[PDB]
Amino acid sequence: TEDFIKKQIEEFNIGKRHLANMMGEDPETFTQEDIDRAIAYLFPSGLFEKRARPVMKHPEQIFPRQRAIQWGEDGRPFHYLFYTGKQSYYSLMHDVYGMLLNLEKHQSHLQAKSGSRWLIKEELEEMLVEKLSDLDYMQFIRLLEKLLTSQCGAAEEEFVQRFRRSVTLESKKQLIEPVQYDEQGMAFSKSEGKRKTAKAEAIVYKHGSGRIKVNGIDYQLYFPITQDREQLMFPFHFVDRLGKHDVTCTVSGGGRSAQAGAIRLAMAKALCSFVTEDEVEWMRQAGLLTTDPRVRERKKPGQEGARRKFTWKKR
Amino acid sequence: NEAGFDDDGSEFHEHIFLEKHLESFPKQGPIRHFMELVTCGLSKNPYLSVKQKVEHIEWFRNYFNEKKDILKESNIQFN
Amino acid sequence: RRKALPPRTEKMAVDQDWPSVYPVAAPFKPSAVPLPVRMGYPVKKGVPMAKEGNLELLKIPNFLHLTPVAIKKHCEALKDFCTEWPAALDSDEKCEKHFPIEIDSTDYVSSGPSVRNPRARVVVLRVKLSSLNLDDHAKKKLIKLVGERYCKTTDVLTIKTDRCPLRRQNYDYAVYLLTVLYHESWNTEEWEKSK
Amino acid sequence: SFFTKLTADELWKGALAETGAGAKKGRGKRTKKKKRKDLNRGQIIGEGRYGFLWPGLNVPLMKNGAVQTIAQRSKEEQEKVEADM
Amino acid sequence: HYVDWRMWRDVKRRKMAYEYADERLRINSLRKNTILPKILQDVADEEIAALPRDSCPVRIRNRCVMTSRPRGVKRRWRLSRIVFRHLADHGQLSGIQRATW
Amino acid sequence: KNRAARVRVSKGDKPVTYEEAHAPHYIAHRKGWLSLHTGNLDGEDHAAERTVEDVFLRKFMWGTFPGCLADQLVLKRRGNQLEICAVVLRQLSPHKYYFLVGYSETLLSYFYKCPVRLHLQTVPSKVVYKYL
Amino acid sequence: VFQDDPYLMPASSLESRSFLLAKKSGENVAKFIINSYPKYFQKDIAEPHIPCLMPEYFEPQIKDISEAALKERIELEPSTDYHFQQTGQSEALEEENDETSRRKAGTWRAKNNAERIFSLMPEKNEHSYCTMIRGMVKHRAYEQALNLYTELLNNRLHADVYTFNALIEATVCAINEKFEEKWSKILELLRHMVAQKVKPNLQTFNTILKCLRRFHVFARSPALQVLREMKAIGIEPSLATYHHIIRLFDQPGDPLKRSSFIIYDIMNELMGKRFSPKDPDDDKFFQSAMSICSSLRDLELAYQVHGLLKTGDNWKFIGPDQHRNFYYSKFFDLICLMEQIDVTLKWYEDLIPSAYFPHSQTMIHLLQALDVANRLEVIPKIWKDSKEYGHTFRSDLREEILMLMARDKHPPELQVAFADCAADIKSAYESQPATSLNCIAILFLRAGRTQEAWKMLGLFRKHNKIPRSELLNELMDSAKVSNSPSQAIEVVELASAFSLPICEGLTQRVMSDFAIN
Amino acid sequence: LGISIKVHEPPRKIERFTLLQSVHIYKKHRVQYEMRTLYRCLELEHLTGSTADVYLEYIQRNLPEGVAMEVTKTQLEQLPEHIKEPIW
Amino acid sequence: NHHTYAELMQTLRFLGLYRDEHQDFMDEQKRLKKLRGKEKPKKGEGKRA
RNA sequence: GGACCUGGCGGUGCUUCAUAUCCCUCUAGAGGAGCCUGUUCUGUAAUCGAUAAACCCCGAUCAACCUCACCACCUCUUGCUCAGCCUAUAUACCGCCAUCUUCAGCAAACCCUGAUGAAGGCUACAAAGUAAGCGCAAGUACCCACGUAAAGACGUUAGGUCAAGGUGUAGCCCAUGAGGUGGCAAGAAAUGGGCUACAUUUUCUACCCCAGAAACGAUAGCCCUUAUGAAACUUAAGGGUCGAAGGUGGAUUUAG
Ligand SMILES: [Mg+2]
Ligand SMILES: [Mg+2]
Ligand SMILES: [Mg+2]
Ligand SMILES: [Mg+2]
Ligand SMILES: [Mg+2]
Ligand SMILES: [Mg+2]
Ligand SMILES: [Mg+2]
């Protein structure tokens, strides 16, 4: 089955040559990302699952790894702990307890001679390819924690850094809108917003009296209901700029509370440009600078609607 | 999509102006109003050929002069 | 009884041009391709299926026939039927000053040898009204006469015609309707004083 | 009403009933049994029920370097192949 | 070989309705008029009730072309909900997929 | 218990192809449509005719060629194209196959009044994807 | 016209033959099942009506009419029904669609009915006499052609080229050493056309040309003169008269191919341009031109027929299968044994691979040309192509290819020669054999493979023939220098046991291998 | 070829209808079938009749088997005849 | 016109060009049904025998 | 008859949970009145099958005439399609599915233990279980990762559908096959589900909710007109007459 791997790698190579030929490029420059672009355009599959695609890659991702033979012709195992079956995991455990034992030896003989994250079990059986369970993995992790606590040298720092990974960003800080200048446009910014099938684009104007215009016409004439008026006063009550903004706005789709919440979100995203950053940090953890995901869900058949069952009699 | 299916080369005015098929009919009254209605009905029908429209026209003429008993009982003269 | 023939995959060399190989839109016989691409939802300890027996490659069309250099070859052989959009007629205001009347057409396609389409016979006529010699009572009469067929905002009279199944026939009909409307716009009738 | 004529294994799954409810509780005497035999072993392509001769299906094409003609056998040759079946 | 008579009689009604189209068209043109007074409409009624049966498209029953079922039919593809589901679950009719929403 | 035209694995003893091993809740996900035509898009006329043509075509092409289809047909469809590409067993003579390809060309092209070119992709056996 | 897929491709021209006849016989029984039920393909769903979609009709719809019934029973046993309804319904036969139509239908009885209509119905006997002389060429009648030309001259009309051309052709058929009779016939026809005031035809030119060129071995001169007489009309000569010209130039032009070049130049004026087709044989002239240029090594006419083959006008390819086979074989043998290795590789890509596989002498020319350029690596694929093509010449092709691998020694880079020897060995013993067995033994001896040499010896030693004496001494050396005298003992005992003359020297080699080794 | 088009996508339509799952009686369980219809237009500007036949041919000789086509030309004309200064 | 389809397949089976497995199976079961001893009555035999 | 194994069961023990859930809790409804649509039954010459969870605006996204498988009467026997059947068997089946299932198991091949018995194979500081495949999970569409949809293995009820369609078993086939008019669908009596209401947060005129006035709801039945149909006896819409009883429903529950 290794000979099949050789044939597949040379077929991938000569197909790379013929893709460079039909695409008119050099076989020395026609690379993997361009290979993906070309084959992705050349065979338009209409499927949603990306594993059901026309795939031509590095064939060692396409083929599973055929395992190394542990014995020669004389039949002796090459690895010392082969006869436990789990040779690689137990070998690694033996080496790690050796590193911990010589580290304890170094601490006793030091008194005598004086962001990142762990792997998962799936990532470990990706690395050391050999199947495990969960309690042995957890025991290995707890051994690593007892490694990481002692006065461990930089070689042992690299050695534990083999099984460390890199976490994502916990970077969710809000986004400032830039102050824009459109034909003597001072104290101006914009944003957008959306809640409950409703799009709204509000403008902030820091030079005006305390009222709101919407599509030119006044927000008292736009809102006869006091709940919506509290909804619009909410951010401006939070930044104490009740009289500093005569503002024009736009909204489209939906009813009273929908357009009110959408305009509130647009004003909240817009007002970051003329405040301190701690203002919108506090506003964000007051709950302002986010989309409310509550869109009403579809009805499911066989029911009254979307949650309620029919009056199923028991008898 | 008009290839071969061509309504036999008729002009637009052979569809619109159908006054050329309405000879033996009166001028001002109820039945000429009925004939204007069926003429303007066949005017706005593009699912029929002009030959078929004149075929329905002659059927109306043949029928309306066929039963002249009640049409002369109708206290108004049909031509 | 039984025979054994290898494909042309080993036979065709490296530098054979693809218009000679894949001219036209293929149902993809995998004898001719030298490209080893697999498609399929693969099994867990296995492979996606290769191109042999690949019905998923048969239902999905390849774009191998449209070789971009062969696209270029067919374009440069198609240089001959061309004309030129004349350079006075590029900015669209000047195109309206030279041609302010637009006639639309309709054509579609269908799966199957039957060709007819019922919605392919309307030719909507679109005239911008500010190019005409319409006087004041005349323009007022044309507005009163058409009614709602004329867009008041950007001054575009739009007249639809589907009373007959031919495009040229309805086009001559809309031209006749404009012709008798611009007959009628001048003429002040007897009751127009009784306004 | 005509287009429900189906494949062969579907006919045998319909009439055989060897995935039905009678197998599991031993719901019959086992002496009542109907086996399954093959219907598609012995009809070659271009086996017409009339005596039809083919240079592409029945008989091989180049008769020592010449084509044969489209023909059809007689009646008693059809009787011979019926008695053979 | 056809076996059945409900399906065959619906095809009978379809073809004899296709014949008797323009005559009933002219009679109902005589019917629905506030002009053209009453007795002409009444002899038109005599005529159209005197027409033979299986001659009006009232009788038309849009049954299936694969199993002849009167009910549970799509008029988009002129067959039953069973056989359309049969060939849809096999995967031949294009565009129709099972809805995952 | 929903049972479609899917495979219900009894033992590891049933050779099954790629097509039969996917249930119709995978069609937009992991499969492909056997025929493809614009008759199901809107707007478009002539739909039920396209369906009866496909059903009669597939049942005819199977019941004519005895066991000479490893899988079902592929009826791609483009106007005046009824393009056949099927997968046949490497059992019989190619002389007889060309006889039958011309036979289906003539009969279909004169019955449904349309240019048809056949294509075949021969397979040595039943194509297998799973022992399911 | 065939598929591209690997299982159904042809590998011989017989395979393509049976493929195409399978296609057309399916088409014929398809049109037979269509006309046996004409009421089944009439429901039309396609709009723009491709006209080949309705069946054809052999029925008469008119009976009480006479001329319409005769035309609708003949031109639409059916000829017998038209003739019987014409004889009993007072329906006069015409001078068109009846004489040659019932002559192709049915040919002494057609002449009998035509003569009864000529003595029974007052038609203008000029065109009827022309069609009667043309039918008399195929009903084997000459004095009727003389009476037809006389009745055409006296029938108050000018004669056609059909009657006089049929007379010239069927009279110069059995021309017993006639060398001036054709010139007298051409001159009398020239006076006849000057009395007829119209140009002479291409039909009479080709007919008199073929009938004069088959009369003597070197009588292509008057045939080429008839080709030039057609060429002096305003239209060009046909390629059929030029084909007869090149054919009579190729038989009697044995010591000099200049007259073959002259008739080839007649064809090059006749078909050496865009094909304006009027010839009955527009392929024989170009095929014979390529055969002359390939049998005389003239690289101008081969290029002429090759450029005229399929690029400019592809009428010059093939009427038969034999036309394509002969043209490809001649040009490929000339390009292989005359040109270098690049053109021979082009021949292997573009005539043997463009048509089907090679012939037996074509494979021998390919093997000799490859032995000139030292290419014995793809001998086995062409050998399988020849054995799939030929049922008798596989044994004569495999050994004649493998002699150069059987006589060249073991190089380190010559393993493909031994593999060709092994594949030809299996294919030549396995298909359906003294020289083949001995050649396989000598080839595997020249291979350099120990098990293969021993297996060829153990196979050939029971083929009722021992090896040759050079092979015997090489085997004795490979035994005695193996410290094992068994094969030397076998060679000596078998060349004494197969009644071969290598007895004393071979037994001395065996005793030297046993005792002196 | 110098045709100067843009690319633009109209919003989708999803036809969703519903059938009975069982055959005799289980009403509360149904089987929905989707029907997704996508939309992809082009605006072809400033070409003559012959050139429109060129590019329309180069589409409709390469038209796939799953997509549709709707052709709507906006043709030109200067003036009707009896419209200059007419009395009928 | 479905009757054309039915009679078309009927002749193609009768000419042996189509292999109609459903009718082969139906004549097999009819063959067994006449082979047992319970076949169709004749025109004129029935309840009145 | 003595002993034992597996499963079921216990108004069987201990412990821990149930997130629309078992209760105490929270909201809105049914059962009380009118009508519509299904079930049993009566009359008639008058359909077929489901009828406990898992059946009831069922099969039906359509029984005034075809839809008529129900019958009376008048007829036909290549009868009509090389026959056909809607004749009895879902207790011969294919095919489609309902509940368990809003799960986590099912499981080919070995090995071991029970003195080599049916059977069992669980202790991570690990005393014999390993393991290919299905499923869950992983994955796909909708607004993403949430959630919804979709899938949901093997078995359970001889579960339902031989009147989606074919089919074995038995029966008719000068009929149980087939062509025509008529009526079968109206209520003795209960009965599941749905709509309307039973008021003052209510009703009406305009306004889409800065007003004013009045301190409710309509079936059926009656007369007329309109829509389609060859035909209004019920189907759909509009005008008018009176408009019944309901004055917020109890054991019992339904859904979130
Ligand atoms: Mg609700
Ligand atoms: Mg389910
Ligand atoms: Mg019955
Ligand atoms: Mg049952
Ligand atoms: Mg899952
Ligand atoms: Mg599910
Ligand atoms: Mg039941």
Tab-separated table of all heavy atoms in Angstrom, chain J residues 49 89-92 158-162, ligand 4:
chain	number	residue	atom	x	y	z
J	49	G	P	-64.511	-1.998	5.671
J	49	G	OP1	-64.628	-3.435	6.029
J	49	G	OP2	-65.523	-1.032	6.168
J	49	G	O5'	-63.073	-1.491	6.134
J	49	G	C5'	-61.943	-2.354	6.105
J	49	G	C4'	-60.677	-1.612	6.453
J	49	G	O4'	-60.454	-0.559	5.481
J	49	G	C3'	-60.677	-0.895	7.797
J	49	G	O3'	-60.318	-1.753	8.867
J	49	G	C2'	-59.691	0.246	7.583
J	49	G	O2'	-58.355	-0.210	7.728
J	49	G	C1'	-59.922	0.584	6.111
J	49	G	N9	-60.868	1.698	5.911
J	49	G	C8	-62.106	1.585	5.335
J	49	G	N7	-62.741	2.718	5.255
J	49	G	C5	-61.864	3.641	5.797
J	49	G	C6	-62.016	5.039	5.972
J	49	G	O6	-62.982	5.750	5.667
J	49	G	N1	-60.891	5.596	6.565
J	49	G	C2	-59.765	4.903	6.944
J	49	G	N2	-58.782	5.623	7.503
J	49	G	N3	-59.614	3.598	6.783
J	49	G	C4	-60.697	3.032	6.208
J	89	U	P	-60.496	-9.407	3.999
J	89	U	OP1	-61.020	-8.725	5.209
J	89	U	OP2	-59.775	-8.619	2.967
J	89	U	O5'	-59.538	-10.589	4.471
J	89	U	C5'	-58.226	-10.314	4.931
J	89	U	C4'	-57.328	-11.520	4.810
J	89	U	O4'	-57.503	-12.141	3.510
J	89	U	C3'	-55.839	-11.230	4.889
J	89	U	O3'	-55.380	-11.098	6.221
J	89	U	C2'	-55.226	-12.405	4.138
J	89	U	O2'	-55.179	-13.559	4.965
J	89	U	C1'	-56.267	-12.639	3.042
J	89	U	N1	-55.935	-11.937	1.779
J	89	U	C2	-54.891	-12.396	0.992
J	89	U	O2	-54.186	-13.354	1.267
J	89	U	N3	-54.685	-11.672	-0.155
J	89	U	C4	-55.390	-10.573	-0.598
J	89	U	O4	-55.074	-10.035	-1.662
J	89	U	C5	-56.454	-10.167	0.263
J	89	U	C6	-56.682	-10.850	1.389
J	90	A	P	-54.842	-9.678	6.745
J	90	A	OP1	-54.728	-9.746	8.225
J	90	A	OP2	-55.662	-8.610	6.120
J	90	A	O5'	-53.374	-9.589	6.138
J	90	A	C5'	-52.923	-8.414	5.475
J	90	A	C4'	-51.687	-7.857	6.134
J	90	A	O4'	-51.043	-6.923	5.227
J	90	A	C3'	-51.936	-7.094	7.431
J	90	A	O3'	-50.839	-7.294	8.320
J	90	A	C2'	-51.967	-5.641	6.965
J	90	A	O2'	-51.646	-4.697	7.964
J	90	A	C1'	-50.931	-5.654	5.844
J	90	A	N9	-51.155	-4.636	4.817
J	90	A	C8	-52.283	-3.883	4.610
J	90	A	N7	-52.182	-3.050	3.603
J	90	A	C5	-50.904	-3.272	3.113
J	90	A	C6	-50.186	-2.702	2.046
J	90	A	N6	-50.676	-1.751	1.247
J	90	A	N1	-48.931	-3.149	1.825
J	90	A	C2	-48.442	-4.101	2.628
J	90	A	N3	-49.016	-4.715	3.661
J	90	A	C4	-50.260	-4.248	3.851
J	91	U	P	-51.009	-8.245	9.604
J	91	U	OP1	-52.256	-7.851	10.309
J	91	U	OP2	-49.718	-8.255	10.336
J	91	U	O5'	-51.227	-9.699	8.989
J	91	U	C5'	-50.146	-10.405	8.390
J	91	U	C4'	-50.497	-11.845	8.092
J	91	U	O4'	-50.560	-12.602	9.334
J	91	U	C3'	-51.834	-12.070	7.384
J	91	U	O3'	-51.704	-13.149	6.461
J	91	U	C2'	-52.757	-12.487	8.525
J	91	U	O2'	-53.868	-13.264	8.130
J	91	U	C1'	-51.800	-13.277	9.412
J	91	U	N1	-52.209	-13.377	10.823
J	91	U	C2	-52.167	-12.259	11.643
J	91	U	O2	-51.804	-11.157	11.272
J	91	U	N3	-52.572	-12.478	12.937
J	91	U	C4	-53.006	-13.665	13.489
J	91	U	O4	-53.338	-13.700	14.675
J	91	U	C5	-53.022	-14.770	12.582
J	91	U	C6	-52.633	-14.589	11.318
J	92	A	P	-51.519	-12.854	4.892
J	92	A	OP1	-51.965	-11.464	4.620
J	92	A	OP2	-52.127	-13.979	4.139
J	92	A	O5'	-49.943	-12.909	4.674
J	92	A	C5'	-49.189	-14.038	5.092
J	92	A	C4'	-48.083	-14.351	4.118
J	92	A	O4'	-48.635	-14.456	2.776
J	92	A	C3'	-46.996	-13.296	3.978
J	92	A	O3'	-46.026	-13.330	5.010
J	92	A	C2'	-46.443	-13.584	2.592
J	92	A	O2'	-45.621	-14.742	2.612
J	92	A	C1'	-47.727	-13.917	1.837
J	92	A	N9	-48.324	-12.697	1.263
J	92	A	C8	-49.265	-11.876	1.835
J	92	A	N7	-49.594	-10.849	1.093
J	92	A	C5	-48.813	-10.999	-0.043
J	92	A	C6	-48.697	-10.230	-1.211
J	92	A	N6	-49.403	-9.117	-1.431
J	92	A	N1	-47.826	-10.651	-2.154
J	92	A	C2	-47.123	-11.767	-1.925
J	92	A	N3	-47.145	-12.576	-0.868
J	92	A	C4	-48.020	-12.128	0.050
J	158	A	P	-49.147	-8.048	17.737
J	158	A	OP1	-50.382	-8.241	16.936
J	158	A	OP2	-48.871	-8.950	18.883
J	158	A	O5'	-47.900	-8.116	16.749
J	158	A	C5'	-47.608	-9.307	16.024
J	158	A	C4'	-47.633	-9.067	14.535
J	158	A	O4'	-47.442	-10.332	13.843
J	158	A	C3'	-48.939	-8.483	14.000
J	158	A	O3'	-48.659	-7.628	12.896
J	158	A	C2'	-49.681	-9.721	13.510
J	158	A	O2'	-50.654	-9.469	12.518
J	158	A	C1'	-48.532	-10.570	12.973
J	158	A	N9	-48.810	-12.009	12.964
J	158	A	C8	-49.448	-12.748	13.929
J	158	A	N7	-49.552	-14.021	13.635
J	158	A	C5	-48.943	-14.127	12.392
J	158	A	C6	-48.727	-15.220	11.534
J	158	A	N6	-49.114	-16.466	11.811
J	158	A	N1	-48.089	-14.985	10.367
J	158	A	C2	-47.699	-13.734	10.088
J	158	A	N3	-47.846	-12.627	10.812
J	158	A	C4	-48.483	-12.894	11.966
J	159	G	P	-49.379	-6.197	12.781
J	159	G	OP1	-50.839	-6.435	12.652
J	159	G	OP2	-48.667	-5.400	11.749
J	159	G	O5'	-49.120	-5.516	14.198
J	159	G	C5'	-50.200	-5.097	15.019
J	159	G	C4'	-50.364	-3.599	14.984
J	159	G	O4'	-49.091	-2.968	15.292
J	159	G	C3'	-50.752	-3.010	13.635
J	159	G	O3'	-52.142	-3.083	13.373
J	159	G	C2'	-50.215	-1.589	13.727
J	159	G	O2'	-51.066	-0.783	14.527
J	159	G	C1'	-48.913	-1.821	14.489
J	159	G	N9	-47.786	-2.079	13.573
J	159	G	C8	-47.079	-3.251	13.456
J	159	G	N7	-46.134	-3.194	12.560
J	159	G	C5	-46.222	-1.905	12.052
J	159	G	C6	-45.455	-1.260	11.050
J	159	G	O6	-44.512	-1.716	10.391
J	159	G	N1	-45.879	0.049	10.844
J	159	G	C2	-46.909	0.663	11.515
J	159	G	N2	-47.184	1.932	11.184
J	159	G	N3	-47.632	0.069	12.450
J	159	G	C4	-47.237	-1.202	12.668
J	160	G	P	-52.667	-3.769	12.018
J	160	G	OP1	-53.654	-4.817	12.381
J	160	G	OP2	-51.482	-4.125	11.197
J	160	G	O5'	-53.436	-2.598	11.260
J	160	G	C5'	-53.566	-1.310	11.844
J	160	G	C4'	-53.412	-0.223	10.810
J	160	G	O4'	-52.132	0.438	10.972
J	160	G	C3'	-53.410	-0.677	9.359
J	160	G	O3'	-54.713	-0.908	8.850
J	160	G	C2'	-52.673	0.457	8.656
J	160	G	O2'	-53.542	1.559	8.437
J	160	G	C1'	-51.645	0.857	9.714
J	160	G	N9	-50.322	0.243	9.484
J	160	G	C8	-49.757	-0.812	10.159
J	160	G	N7	-48.564	-1.117	9.725
J	160	G	C5	-48.321	-0.208	8.704
J	160	G	C6	-47.192	-0.043	7.859
J	160	G	O6	-46.135	-0.687	7.836
J	160	G	N1	-47.375	1.004	6.960
J	160	G	C2	-48.495	1.794	6.881
J	160	G	N2	-48.494	2.759	5.948
J	160	G	N3	-49.552	1.650	7.664
J	160	G	C4	-49.398	0.638	8.545
J	161	U	P	-54.944	-1.981	7.675
J	161	U	OP1	-56.406	-2.203	7.541
J	161	U	OP2	-54.045	-3.136	7.924
J	161	U	O5'	-54.437	-1.233	6.363
J	161	U	C5'	-55.062	-0.039	5.917
J	161	U	C4'	-54.253	0.644	4.842
J	161	U	O4'	-52.953	1.018	5.366
J	161	U	C3'	-53.929	-0.196	3.615
J	161	U	O3'	-55.001	-0.248	2.689
J	161	U	C2'	-52.681	0.482	3.064
J	161	U	O2'	-53.028	1.641	2.318
J	161	U	C1'	-51.978	0.928	4.349
J	161	U	N1	-50.925	-0.022	4.778
J	161	U	C2	-49.705	0.030	4.128
J	161	U	O2	-49.471	0.812	3.223
J	161	U	N3	-48.769	-0.871	4.575
J	161	U	C4	-48.923	-1.797	5.586
J	161	U	O4	-47.985	-2.543	5.874
J	161	U	C5	-50.209	-1.786	6.212
J	161	U	C6	-51.141	-0.919	5.798
J	162	C	P	-55.718	-1.645	2.352
J	162	C	OP1	-57.114	-1.357	1.934
J	162	C	OP2	-55.468	-2.575	3.483
J	162	C	O5'	-54.928	-2.192	1.080
J	162	C	C5'	-54.259	-3.448	1.122
J	162	C	C4'	-53.786	-3.879	-0.245
J	162	C	O4'	-52.877	-5.005	-0.094
J	162	C	C3'	-54.886	-4.344	-1.196
J	162	C	O3'	-54.531	-4.007	-2.537
J	162	C	C2'	-54.856	-5.859	-1.027
J	162	C	O2'	-55.366	-6.583	-2.127
J	162	C	C1'	-53.367	-6.118	-0.821
J	162	C	N1	-53.080	-7.329	-0.041
J	162	C	C2	-52.205	-8.286	-0.559
J	162	C	O2	-51.683	-8.085	-1.667
J	162	C	N3	-51.944	-9.403	0.161
J	162	C	C4	-52.526	-9.579	1.349
J	162	C	N4	-52.249	-10.694	2.031
J	162	C	C5	-53.426	-8.621	1.899
J	162	C	C6	-53.672	-7.522	1.177
K	4	MG	MG	-54.695	-6.829	6.869
